[PDB]
Amino acid sequence: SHGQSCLGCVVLVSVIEQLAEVHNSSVQVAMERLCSYLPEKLFLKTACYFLVQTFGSDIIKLLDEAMKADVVCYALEFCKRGAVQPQCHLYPLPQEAWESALEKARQVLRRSCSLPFLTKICQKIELSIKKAVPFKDVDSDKHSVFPTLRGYHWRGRDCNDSDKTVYPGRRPDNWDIHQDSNCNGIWGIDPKDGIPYEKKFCEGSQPRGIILLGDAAGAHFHIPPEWLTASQMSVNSFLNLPSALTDELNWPQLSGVTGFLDSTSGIEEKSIYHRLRKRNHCNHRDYQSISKNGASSRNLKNFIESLSRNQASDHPAIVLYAMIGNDVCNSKADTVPEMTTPEQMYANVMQTLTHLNSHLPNGSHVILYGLPDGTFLWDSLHNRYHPLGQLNKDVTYAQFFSFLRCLQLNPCNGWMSSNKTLRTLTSERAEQLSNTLKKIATTETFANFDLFYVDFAFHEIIEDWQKRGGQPWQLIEPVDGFHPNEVASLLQANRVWEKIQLQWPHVLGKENPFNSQIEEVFGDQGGH
Numbered sequence: 001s002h003g004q005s006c007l008g009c010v011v012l013v014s015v016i017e018q019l020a021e022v023h024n025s026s027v028q029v030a031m032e033r034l035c036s037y038l039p040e041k042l043f044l045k046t047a048c049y050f051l052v053q054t055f056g057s058d059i060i061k062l063l064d065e066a067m068k069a070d071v072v073c074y075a076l077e078f079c080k081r082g083a084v085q086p087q088c089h090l091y092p093l094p095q096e097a098w099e100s101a102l103e104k105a106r107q108v109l110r111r112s113c114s115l116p117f118l119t120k121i122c123q124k125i126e127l128s129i130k131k132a133v134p135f136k137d138v139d140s141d142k143h144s145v146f147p148t149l150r151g152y153h154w155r156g157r158d159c160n161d162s163d164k165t166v167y168p169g170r171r172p173d174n175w176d177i178h179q180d181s182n183c184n185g186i187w188g189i190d191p192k193d194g195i196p197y198e199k200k201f202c203e204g205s206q207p208r209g210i211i212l213l214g215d216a217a218g219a220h221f222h223i224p225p226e227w228l229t230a231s232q233m234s235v236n237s238f239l240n241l242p243s244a245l246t247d248e249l250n251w252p253q254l255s256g257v258t259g260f261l262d263s264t265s266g267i268e269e270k271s272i273y274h275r276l277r278k279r280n281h282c283n284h285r286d287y288q289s290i291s292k293n294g295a296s297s298r299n300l301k302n303f304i305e306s307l308s309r310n311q312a313s314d315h316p317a318i319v320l321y322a323m324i325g326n327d328v329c330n331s332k333a334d335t336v337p338e339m340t341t342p343e344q345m346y347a348n349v350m351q352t353l354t355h356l357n358s359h360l361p362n363g364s365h366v367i368l369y370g371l372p373d374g375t376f377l378w379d380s381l382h383n384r385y386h387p388l389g390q391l392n393k394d395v396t397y398a399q400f401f402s403f404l405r406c407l408q409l410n411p412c413n414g415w416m417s418s419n420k421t422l423r424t425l426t427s428e429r430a431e432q433l434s435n436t437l438k439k440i441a442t443t444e445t446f447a448n449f450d451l452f453y454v455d456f457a458f459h460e461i462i463e464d465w466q467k468r469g470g471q472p473w474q475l476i477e478p479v480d481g482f483h484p485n486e487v488a489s490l491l492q493a494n495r496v497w498e499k500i501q502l503q504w505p506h507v508l509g510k511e512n513p514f515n516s517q518i519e520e521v522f523g524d525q526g527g528h
């Protein structure tokens, strides 16, 4: 909270200063320009102009004294030193020079979420974090007709939000003669022979859904670098800001597992959902991302009940257990003691699997993902420039991670660290947890699903990518410097798909021979 207010101030002031540089304008003009770019939705533009009204004169005075954003934000008291909270420097400065600058700033100012609108934004964000089910959902079946706030970006769109027995993944109601009860777009009678289309096209095709149990990576956490790069900034940079905020800065609709939109990169690789739908068009809309920022084996229990699958009335599902780093990645200064132990991981996963067995239809399939070896994050990025540092070449990822660490906001103290010993210990723990998951999958059995393990194998992805001409830093989210980006997520989903195809082809089911007839009769099946 102190960390978040400090970091927010430093980012905003940095963008203001860089916009003044890019346009060769005054700071007043740069601040007007920033606010002018923002959407009116969610009070974003209005909040910006209120901030400029409240703090703008002081920002002008301190940038006029050549203070950088970190000094400005301490002078303005958005950043504060405490007994167990040192002052955090984003830019390298001798201590004397930092203290002189901060004292000058404080002198300049002496000469002469409670805020309106921002409070509204803060409340809506908190509510989005707290809730794992859609806000708009008249019939309470957890599927929505709206995209964000845990709506159809996260799970198949509800084709009838006035009927809690109509939703994606349901076994059809007497072959869907009069209503498309399972939202796959297939319904009605073939006039040639009187046979219900859902019966002739889907009977015996063994439909199944895809369910992700995921973290921020799984939900495709992504802050557009366009929001922080003054050199290319305009109105069009922020058009996606309202939707991204109401999706908790996640983009599940573009994720490697549950993505259903056309990919940004346009690469061949498609999401697991897209491949399952392609294999059997009866599976149209049967995706769910049961994923939350910060999820780990320890706290998945706090939102897994948001999963929607009726054991008696729904088709089976492929369930991917993808707690792929927060059991080792944390923000505690003494970070190793905070990491999950193999014994804790065993207990936590067994509790999840026992819960799943009583909440999945029989015939389901559960795949446990191993944890990545994140040592290539530091290796790939530490000398490159962060988006906020690209204009003036003055913030490397090493400097960015050090700043976050000081603020207790670094998302992975163990891997995003200049300390090689610590990075090695973190990878060792991740491999021990992966071994625990592999032991569970090859030993424990459950009545309603079979159980499997797949390794994460980031090295396979980096090799695929380097073979195509790419570099490893291009696989990482530029703003957070931590999460796999959209490309990386899709490449990893491709590896997983192909492993399942070779190792356990029954998990994917058969290719439906009526796919082409489904498209001829129903087209896009109602879209997404």
Ligand SMILES: CCCCCCCCCCCCCCCCCC(=O)OC[C@H](COP(=O)([O-])O)OC(=O)CCCCCCCCCCCCCCCCC
Binding pocket: 004, 005, 007, 008, 009, 011, 012, 015, 051, 055, 078, 215, 216, 217, 221, 223, 227, 228, 292, 293, 294, 295, 326, 409, 411, 479, 480
């Ligand atoms: C004087 C006015 C002051 C107020 C002005 C407001 C300006 C913007 C406020 C910034 C608020 C800072 C929020 C940081 C927290 C976001 C990340 C988060 O909470 O989600 C969890 C995520 C990953 O979770 P996991 O991987 O641990 O599972 O955790 C992470 O991935 C950590 C992310 C850390 C990197 C963030 C770098 C930059 C912040 C992004 C700001 C977004 C820009 C918004 C518009 C900008 C207008 C210029």
Ligand SMILES: *[C@@H]1O[C@H](CO)[C@@H](O[C@@H]2O[C@H](CO)[C@@H](O)[C@H](O)[C@H]2NC(C)=O)[C@H](O)[C@H]1NC(C)=O
Binding pocket: 160, 162, 163, 179, 180
């Ligand atoms: C969505 O579900 C609602 C509720 O089941 C449907 O409305 C019903 O329509 C039938 C049609 O025969 C009526 O007999 C019921 O009285 C209606 N129920 C209510 C509560 O109004 C609606 O038709 C469904 N939409 C589609 C496209 O099938």
Ligand SMILES: *[C@@H]1O[C@H](CO)[C@@H](O[C@@H]2O[C@H](CO)[C@@H](O)[C@H](O)[C@H]2NC(C)=O)[C@H](O)[C@H]1NC(C)=O
Binding pocket: 419, 420, 421, 422, 425
């Ligand atoms: C780099 O990290 C390593 C591992 O976390 C630190 O090594 C530990 O240091 C403490 C004392 O500071 C010892 O009690 C531990 O036994 C050490 N553990 C290991 C595995 O060596 C090391 O101090 C860190 N180095 C720097 C420069 O911060």
Ligand SMILES: CCCCCCCCCCCCCC(=O)O
Binding pocket: 012, 044, 047, 048, 051, 121, 125, 129, 245, 248, 249, 293
């Ligand atoms: C410049 C004025 C507008 C400021 C908008 C603040 C946007 C940052 C909010 C951070 C959202 C975090 C969402 C989440 O990860 O749960």
Ligand SMILES: *[C@@H]1O[C@H](CO)[C@@H](O)[C@H](O)[C@H]1NC(C)=O
Binding pocket: 362, 363, 447, 448
């Ligand atoms: C559940 O499905 C599995 C796999 O198809 C099958 O072997 C088993 O007999 C089923 N269990 C029941 C109780 O029908």
Ligand SMILES: [Ca+2]
Binding pocket: 137, 138, 139, 140, 141, 142, 143, 144, 145, 158, 160, 161
């Ligand atoms: Ca609904």
Ligand SMILES: [Ca+2]
Binding pocket: 139, 141, 143, 158, 159, 160, 161, 162, 163, 164, 165, 166, 167
């Ligand atoms: Ca419904």
Ligand SMILES: [Ca+2]
Binding pocket: 172, 176, 179, 180, 181, 182, 183, 184, 185, 186, 187, 198
């Ligand atoms: Ca149907």
